[PDB]
Amino acid sequence: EFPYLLSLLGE
Amino acid sequence: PYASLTEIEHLVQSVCKSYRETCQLRLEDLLRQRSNIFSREEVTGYQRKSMWEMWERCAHHLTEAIQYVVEFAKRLSGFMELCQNDQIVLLKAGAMEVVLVRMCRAYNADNRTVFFEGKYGGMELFRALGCSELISSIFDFSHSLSALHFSEDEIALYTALVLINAHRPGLQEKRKVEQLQYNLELAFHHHLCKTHRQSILAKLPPKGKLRSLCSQHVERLQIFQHLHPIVVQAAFPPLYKELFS
Ligand SMILES: O=S(=O)(c1ccccc1)N(CC(F)(F)F)c1ccc(C(O)(C(F)(F)F)C(F)(F)F)cc1
Structure with missing residues (x-):
């Protein structure tokens, strides 16, 4: 439930 | 499986480098700008701003600070080894805490x-x-x-x-x-020992101090959000909502 957090972790 | 002295020395270097690359503002810049102070007119400007606008500005700036903490986490030795769930749990709980500590530089x-x-x-x-x-x-x-x-x-x-x-x-x-x-503790303690600064340990903030400040922040955010729910929807960063909403 954390798409922007995962996106940052993935960048 | 525990770490050698060499691994601990490497870990000190690694952690310091990660911080250096993600500290957002350089200390020397911050210090040299101490004489640059908002005038009475500019302070009046800020005080006259609306509650919602001030809240949205502060949420923006906090969110930017939080992104740098995430980058810090990503460059930290052994963070990537954590499962995805635990990465989120640690950052959701700790990111704001780290920002409150980093604030003393400014x-x-x-x-x-x-x-x-x-x-x-x-x-x-x-x-x-x-x-x-x-x-x-x-x-x-x-x-x-x-x-x-x-x-x-x-x-x-x-x-x-x-x-x-x-x-x-x-x-x-x-x-x-x-x-x-534990290994990060060993690194911190090693560094302090080498620099003759072990006396700071007793002076560090008491355990649930950071937790208290973060819990108060969330409470105030919830009171705001309750009073101005559309502002939060329309103008607060998504990351901020995910962290705190
Ligand atoms: O915690 S705050 O109340 C806050 C409110 C709303 C959104 C984010 C943060 N606020 C506290 C302060 F007193 F400083 F205002 C807050 C304001 C500014 C910051 C910032 O530290 C800084 F530097 F801008 F002042 C930053 F965000 F950047 F970190 C952090 C928290």
């Missing part, structure tokens, strides 16, 4: 001001937010940290431990986090 104890939007200003700049007690708590916490005179390397090693805290509820691989935490 705080001038001589005149009780903080670097904000390009100049130094006192707590009165923040009147429009309508949460004087929270503001006061934040300035008090920065003042307590100013007295320790952290080095940048100390800030690096201490914020690593603020993030890698095995006692967060919800962690699924507690033991792995305990091991990473």
